[PDB]
Design a protein around this ligand. Sequence first.
Ligand SMILES: CCC(=O)NCCNC(=O)CCNC(=O)[C@H](O)C(C)(C)COP(=O)(O)O
Ligand SMILES: CCC(=O)NCCNC(=O)CCNC(=O)[C@H](O)C(C)(C)COP(=O)(O)O
Lengths: 339, 341
Amino acid sequence: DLYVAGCGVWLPPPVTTEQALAAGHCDRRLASSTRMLSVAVADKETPAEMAALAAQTALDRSGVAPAHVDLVLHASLYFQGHHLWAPSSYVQRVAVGNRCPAMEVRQVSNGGMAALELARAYLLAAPDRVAALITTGDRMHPPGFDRWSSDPGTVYADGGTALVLSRQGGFARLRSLVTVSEPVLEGMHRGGHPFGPPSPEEQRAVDLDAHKRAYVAEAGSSFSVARVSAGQEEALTGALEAAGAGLDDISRVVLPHMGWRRLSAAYFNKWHIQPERTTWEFGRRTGHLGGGDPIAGFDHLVGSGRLAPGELCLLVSVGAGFSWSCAVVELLERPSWAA
Amino acid sequence: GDLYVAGCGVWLPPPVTTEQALAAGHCDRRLASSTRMLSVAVADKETPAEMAALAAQTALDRSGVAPAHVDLVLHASLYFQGHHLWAPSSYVQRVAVGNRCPAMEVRQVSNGGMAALELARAYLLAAPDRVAALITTGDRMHPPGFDRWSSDPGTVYADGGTALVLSRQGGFARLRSLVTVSEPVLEGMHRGGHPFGPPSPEEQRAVDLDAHKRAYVAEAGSSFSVARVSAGQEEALTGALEAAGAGLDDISRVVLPHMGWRRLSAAYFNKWHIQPERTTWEFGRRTGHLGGGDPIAGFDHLVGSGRLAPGELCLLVSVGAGFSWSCAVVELLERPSWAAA
Ligand SMILES: CCC(=O)NCCNC(=O)CCNC(=O)[C@H](O)C(C)(C)COP(=O)(O)O
Ligand SMILES: CCC(=O)NCCNC(=O)CCNC(=O)[C@H](O)C(C)(C)COP(=O)(O)O
């Protein structure tokens, strides 16, 4: 199989829900239903800057030489700051210093696990390949984005994450990785008829709620909820089965950093697992890093010593489209940078 | 090189002539002359993923490959896809494939099609039972954010979609080589901020790549910039030729980016001493730059117009800001039924 050789995050200072309420960015009803405590917010740091910083951390920990990094993939879900510019080449220039292929991979909030899929294949496609770097980075600022209200129920963070995947060795083994696609749901996140062509553009601003309501009215709530539930179930069961494990075999579940209401509907009141078995407390203080959530969550569990050698971790990620990815990761040893 | 091209296609909206552009004040006479563009495909109502999906329907139908045999869908683009936090690749998959393999975006600015081809090749090769992959491109380069004539003087940007179906099973052409080169020292040329510092957080509402280029060159040096670009292009060319066991003289047709005449002459005609008549120059100058899509559209043109004969070799040439370069040698095995004589 493949190994996680390194990982890291770069998170700008948090803004608390209390500060957000006082600043008017946020209403009480939303604070209450999401149960968020705080979210990382950048000042001047741009998406690729934060990704390269996380990447520098992940690479240092991995100890992998630049020449053994055979691919760089940068994932993100929002504007990277400069049109017709190569943010992955920035990540490569600053964090890696080598000349392998560097490109972007996007799959909305599932982008990190999507990049992991392509990185796994790339490493397996040739016998001499060693490692791949995956990064994520996003800066969810005005004018085009409202971290509290553009997609109500999820509060968006600024920051970067990174993971080093390796065929040679590492502190954890990737026991399975399964990705599920249900493209009938793609219209849920755009204008135009759900089952026809998209409408004309909308750069500022992001308003996901209206598009969802329109989708549901056309396809029906029954259809929408059932297709979403089914896709999530396929990813879970596929990943667990591929790893020879059941959900009871899992010590910690890395969930997306969504608000409480969404996490309860999707996971807690569905799978009947307890919050303490998940990254809920970490996520509710961090915010949604898009495709980066499973990397940030795994890094936190490992870094804080909350995952022990021999224990299995389940990564859970979902993106508009829809796409789902689940992965089972086995911790082999506590890395030197952990507690 | 045991991969095949099984299908390809394009969907191009109606052309706007340079004459129309000149009359509209979108183009000046100096630019028209220097680029020698005749026309550019321009979309009216069509959006990027819509055009990509149309090209994919064409590519898939031509390939005869079953949707179930499509194991990966990659959609490449260089500009805003029309909706944020929305998945254009899933639109492409819903409309053109109707299957449930992974579907995602790959970007590498104007090298995005070949970058997707690199990842698709690896994906197909990574498990013994995988069959085909679909790569698409699509962009719509409209005002106010973009000026297709002036945002990047020297290249005129097109709206349109392209698609290619790659297969391990079989197809009408064989992928003999594909090589990608990366020179990330050049990344600053296409953004604000210091070339060797962090990107500026100040967004440039109207894209002006010429301003960014001038700032980069003033800092990194003109000589350094030209040479590093030249070298990257040379590495990709020679690498792809060597990997295919071929020399430039063995290549019957060259698919070049749809840049303006001045750029093509500097980068290719006066450098490689190859004939414009041996390239897709005439097709490109009527189509415009489709970003990562050029090599697909150019290859599609050559095959569909019957200009490539069985046994003959084709060189695909692609470059993107970053910079990244990709070249590929494709061998035509048979004239596909959808082609002309
Ligand atoms: C950045 C956008 C993105 O990719 N988000 C990940 C996908 N979005 C979600 O998973 C949010 C949860 N939404 C759903 O499960 C379905 O769409 C529902 C259940 C039909 C509506 O959800 P709701 O808005 O009520 O929370
Ligand atoms: C922005 C879309 C995109 O990715 N385009 C591919 C990269 N851009 C180009 O290749 C344009 C040609 N530019 C170059 O060859 C180098 O930048 C030079 C040689 C340093 C300056 O070229 P010029 O702008 O004078 O034509």
